[PDB]
Amino acid sequence: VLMVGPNFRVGKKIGCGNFGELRLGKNLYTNEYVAIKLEPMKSRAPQLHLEYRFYKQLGSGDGIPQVYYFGPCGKYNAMVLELLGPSLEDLFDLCDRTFSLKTVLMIAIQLISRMEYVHSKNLIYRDVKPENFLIGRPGNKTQQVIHIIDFALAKEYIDPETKKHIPYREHKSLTGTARYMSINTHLGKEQSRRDDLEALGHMFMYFLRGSLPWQGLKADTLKERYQKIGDTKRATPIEVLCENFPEMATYLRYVRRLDFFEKPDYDYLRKLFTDLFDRKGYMFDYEYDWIGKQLPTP
Ligand SMILES: Nc1nc(Nc2ccc(S(N)(=O)=O)cc2)nn1C(=S)Nc1c(F)cccc1F
Numbered sequence: 001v002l003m004v005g006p007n008f009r010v011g012k013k014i015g016c017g018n019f020g021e022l023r024l025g026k027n028l029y030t031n032e033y034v035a036i037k038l039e040p041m042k043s044r045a046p047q048l049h050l051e052y053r054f055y056k057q058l059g060s061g062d063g064i065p066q067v068y069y070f071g072p073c074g075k076y077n078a079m080v081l082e083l084l085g086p087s088l089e090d091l092f093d094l095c096d097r098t099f100s101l102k103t104v105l106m107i108a109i110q111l112i113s114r115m116e117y118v119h120s121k122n123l124i125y126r127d128v129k130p131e132n133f134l135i136g137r138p139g140n141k142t143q144q145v146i147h148i149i150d151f152a153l154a155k156e157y158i159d160p161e162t163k164k165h166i167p168y169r170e171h172k173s174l175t176g177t178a179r180y181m182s183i184n185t186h187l188g189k190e191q192s193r194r195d196d197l198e199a200l201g202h203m204f205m206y207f208l209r210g211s212l213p214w215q216g217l218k219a220d221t222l223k224e225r226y227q228k229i230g231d232t233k234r235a236t237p238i239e240v241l242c243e244n245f246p247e248m249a250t251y252l253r254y255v256r257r258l259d260f261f262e263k264p265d266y267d268y269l270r271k272l273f274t275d276l277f278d279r280k281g282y283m284f285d286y287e288y289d290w291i292g293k294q295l296p297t298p
Contacts, residue, residue: 004078005069010036014298019047019152024298025080027068033298034068035083038076047152048077054123054151055081061117063110063147065134084147085137086295089130092207094296095289099207101245102282103289107133107146108204108273114148115200116266119193122158125151126191128199129177130206138295144286157192166190168260178229179212183256186230194258197269201252208245247276 002010007029014035015022020043025036039048052070060066069080088107092099099107111133118125125148132150136142153175157166169190176185180202182195206212214232219225238256242249251272258264277284 002074004036004073004080005071008034008036008069008078008080010038010073010078012298019150020076024083027080033083034080035065036073037079037081038073039078041072041075041077046077048079051150051152051154052079054154055079057123057156058118058121058151061114061121063114063142063145064117065147065149082147083137083298084134084149085140085143085297086135086290087131088133088135088146088207090296091135091288091290092130094293098210099289101208101280102277102287104204104207105273105277105280105282106284106286106288107207108200109270109277109284110146111148111200112197112266112270112273114146115193115196116264118148118154118196119157119264122156122160123151123154124157124191124193125154125196126175126185127151127153127177128180128196128203130203135295138297144288155191165261166192174226178226179206179215181230183230183233186226186233190260192260192262193264194255194260194262197255197258197264198252201248201255204248205241205245205252208248213241247272 004010007027009026009028011024011026013021014024020039023036023038025034027034039046052067055067058064065082065084067079067081071078127150134147134149136145159166170188172188172190174185175191180199182198185191185195213236214229217225217228219228238249238252242252251269
């Protein structure tokens with residue numbers, strides 16, 4: 001009998017995490033399923049209200065989920081947003097944890113554009129991981145579109161007061177997933193646009209290889225674990241990380257060498273991948289590896 005706002009019925013748990021809970025919802029007024037992200041009001045470290053402001057700042061973008069509502073819901077703050085499909089991580093599992101180059105390239109082309117969009121709205125994303133990239137709903141007009149989701153860790157990298165790029169600094173506690181995060185993120189540096197692009201590169205390599213060569217590093221503290229992973233990242237030449245994928249190596253070398261304040265050349269990066277895509281005789285037809293598989297649905 002729980003409701004969010006005038007018209008959103010809260011249904012079954014379709015997920016949870018440190019963030020709180022994901023529920024299937026229904027807009028009763030429109031007969032449409034929605035996703036309802038719930039954060040306990042009692043939360044130390046609220047991030048749902050921030051995230052809602054980020055989405056409003058992103059506005060309606062290609063591959064940006066629509067957000068319908070922010071408001072209270074029993075002992076939770078609730079954000080009603082577009083019900084999307086499976087994550088790239090869930091899809092990766094469906095596809096035996098390797099994607100074809102065609103798939104990774106279709107993903108990468110889209111995601112460079114997504115990131116560029118986020119960046120054009122003066123946001124850095126700072127939580128690149130396969131779990132935060134969702135296809136649209138099986139059957140929907142956007143099932144083929146890779147969406148970017150979860151802006152809880154985002155930040156305005158252009159200060160709205162000054163309209164200047166945020167300053168460089170270090171001693172930043174680490175933001176994002178260890179596996180994909182930029183080398184500079186490991187070093188406690190302020191993240192900027194480069195770091196989102198580098199994280200994507202890492203994730204692309206994950207998709208292509210099946211794994212990254214710094215997965216499963218154990219340490220006694222989370223700080224030591226992050227440190228070892230970043231050490232391994234620094235110790236692993238792009239040449240061997242991206243062996244057999246010359247354009248990924250080029251992408252990764254480029255993003256890693258970006259200056260803190262530097263506007264990435266997204267056109268260049270897209271073209272590395274679109275020129276590759278074309279040389280391989282791939283057709284951008286959204287025939288991803290997971291097409292014709294039974295996709296999980298709430
Ligand atoms: N907006 C949205 N739609 C969906 N769709 C979804 C969720 C679960 C499943 S399931 N239950 O694995 O089949 C399928 C599609 N998930 N979703 C969100 S916001 N997922 C999500 C996320 F992608 C990252 C962090 C927290 C979350 F709640």
